[PDB]
Design a protein around this ligand. Structure first.
Ligand SMILES: Ic1ccc(Nc2nc(C3CC3)nc3ccccc23)cc1
Ligand SMILES: Ic1ccc(Nc2nc(C3CC3)nc3ccccc23)cc1
Ligand code: NI
Lengths: 312, 307, 310
């Protein structure tokens, strides 16, 4: 292992900065391991360590403050987070968005939400890098949080740049398309236990580079309307309506995207008495997405995240 | 002299008791569960509110219902009897709970923690205009509208602490030319017109209160149809009044809340989303399951769902 | 009686052990979850009841199943053959850890519920006892059936032993339940209409089917043949026949369906018939759970029942 160690607050308070953030606007423990991102681990209690854009971070919070420290993978000396680095963290947690106001609105139109959301405040959507989000959720088919976390970790060690080692944890940045598109990529990824998903990863990387003109295409979908972005993602190998809706909600700034599968069907039927007006089909899935947009409004995906967090 | 809300230890000379197990009646489940909007717990375990132009305070032990009335004398026999009628204590809740539990496994699991849920026997006039006055969302907003309505149009009875108690208005007061303008200011919106119109309609039809009293004796089906001819009264409101004021224990008021319970807890779908015909079907389902006190069994499930 | 219910600290000379993880068997989830109606927790963590005309007390640690047997005879610790009949009764040859894994892999709902409810397995019951027990199961709950079976056994079954104020009787044979008095007697013991089905089914197995060797033939016969054969008996429909199949005739795929399974299926799985409870829709719901969980569907059901009853 490495002589360099995971930081805690009160081990090294010189190296931590703070963002003013109520625990009611963000609970790290509900957002960082609830199946949005698969790159955060609680390495010591209340201290969440993980990768953002080829930098490792540790995060912890009091009732009113979000405390962050950053580790850089170069000669540069151990330093407290910069202003620009704090701003990318403010963007990542979309803290511009008032969760208090959204919770109020959903509770006003949905009695079920009002009962369940009391114990589950500070559930918001991370704003993820599209590349990371796409290839993460391509590995999401027929999977659970624990197994995906493993696949993504091994995928990053194999294809992503080595950043730094803290204790016995070696941190890698998320691979670029070129690394995942290479001739060995599928064989290698299959060894790492991706199974059939290994093909979709290589094929989607090749497709975006050759057919769509690189990662600037995923950035175009961030600006494009929800419907255009969703259809465009669904043309990729391994990406159907569910995965396209996850990416839309979590990386392409489409707060109205409602990823539908057996889990959402179960909630809808049990808690709302919903049946299709036309069992899961492509058309009924779209109908159930529309139902939740009609009920909750243009941040329907965000309301869904609160119900998922409350069901788990 | 400044008069205060009584407690049982403070002035026990002025309290009478009715023998009543806490299993036959829990005041805390019945008096602020959206049947009546005129009871507040002004001090702990002590419920104060208006019955027929008199203020009462109510509290209970495990075996006794303690009541005091403000008109300095203890409640009379006739006054105790109107309170016995109000809580319909002739009806054995122990026997009903037994019967429902015997035919309904779900009820048996849920009703354990929620004993003493019964239906108040409300004045028809107060019940009708209370439930017309509701957007039918929340207890708090209706409680406000009814309180302000009573201060504006009802006779002043007494003041206890900083609470001024008014009796419910008579039909004449709600039927007047000013009634709609006034009620609109009190925030009723378009419902203010249905209140005035329904008051006029009931007065026009024989004796005002005497018509609603006829519906109390009339069969459930006749009473329900008759209420539905009133401005602002549909099947749901007519079923509330039937169950709560017209002695129709089989009345099952149906809306999205009952649909949710029925579907989730009983696996019920219509055999023909909410429609008038499907709502009637769901009412029939619960009468078939629970029997002639279906409305009372419903009240237990509502009390157990809200907690 | 001068003879008392044993506890593990009171008389450890008379107890033997079977190596058995609490993850493979929780007595407290299996012995009063409506499979058998003959086990009571007479002292905490100590389950006393009848197996094959012998009384047992059972208790467990995290890794061991501790058993003592009461036989007049010299007070002795359980024999090897007696331990083996207990190993058969709990079907401990079957890996519950492997089955739980398989069900959890194909069913997210099961995975959430089965965490707190491990060691739910199916007892292997005597067919006669299971048949007449579950004939009394129509329009009934665990508490009321436990009473009917207890009174039935005292009235018609041989006295085995008394421990404290509890007199233990073996289950009656068919001949005892088939007599001219049987229905009148059983009606007094509070069985109601079920008293008729008990006498009639006893008569039917003796006269029409050639005695209890018929129930042993159904244990060897395929599920579907055994089920149809049970359904020819008075008071045995699809639900009771499926209970007997699962709990006594070694048919792990049998899924007893009634209003209780309908409720779980609809609420927890969003299932509707691809067509309210009917004979055909009940069969459809049984097929749904066999399709989902595989050939041990009945065992997976038992886990959900144990988790629903809490
Ligand atoms: I709002 C929200 C929050 C979290 C996630 N998480 C995941 N959603 C799904 C299905 C339900 C779409 N499947 C997954 C499988 C494995 C891991 C994470 C998953 C999706 C949407
Ligand atoms: I796997 C399994 C586990 C326990 C039981 N128990 C019982 N199942 C039923 C209906 C639901 C089939 N009804 C009963 C009535 C009374 C007592 C016990 C009963 C059945 C199957
Ligand atoms: Ni349904």
């Amino acid at each position: 292992g490495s002589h360099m160690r995971h930081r805690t607050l009160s081990s090294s308070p010189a190296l931590w900065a703070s963002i003013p953030c109520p625990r009611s606007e963000l609970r790290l423990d509900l957002v960082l391991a609830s199946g949005q991102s698969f790159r955060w681990k609680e390495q010591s209690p209340a201290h969440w360590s993980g990768v953002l854009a080829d930098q490792v971070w540790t995060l912890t919070q009091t009732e009113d403050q979000l405390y962050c420290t950053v580790y850089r993978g170069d000669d540069s000396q151990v330093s407290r987070p910069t202003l620009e680095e704090l701003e990318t963290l403010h963007k990542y947690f979309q803290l511009d968005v008032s969760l208090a106001q959204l919770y109020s609105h959903w509770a006003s139109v949905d009695s079920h939400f009002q009962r369940v959301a009391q114990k589950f405040q500070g559930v918001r959507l991370l704003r993820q890098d599209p590349t990371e989000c796409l290839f993460s959720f391509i590995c999401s088919s027929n999977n659970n949080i624990a197994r995906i976390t493993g696949m993504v970790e091994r995928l990053c060690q194999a294809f992503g740049p080595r950043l730094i080692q803290l204790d016995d944890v070696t941190y890698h940045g998320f691979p670029n398309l070129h690394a995942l598109a290479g001739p060995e990529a599928e064989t290698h990824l299959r060894k790492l236990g991706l199974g059939y998903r290994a093909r979709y990863v290589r094929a989607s990387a090749k497709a975006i580079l050759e057919e769509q003109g690189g990662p600037a295409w995923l950035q175009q979908l961030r600006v494009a309307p929800y419907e255009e972005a969703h259809k465009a993602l669904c043309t990729l190998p391994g990406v159907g309506a569910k995965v396209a809706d996850c990416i839309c909600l979590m990386a392409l700034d489409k707060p109205q995207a409602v990823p539908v599968d057996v889990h959402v069907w179960q909630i809808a039927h049990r808690d709302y008495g919903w049946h299709p007006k036309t069992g899961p089909s492509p058309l009924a899935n779209k109908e159930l997405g529309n139902f939740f947009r009609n009920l909750w409004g243009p941040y329907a995906g965000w309301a869904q995240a609160v119900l998922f967090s409350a069901d788990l």
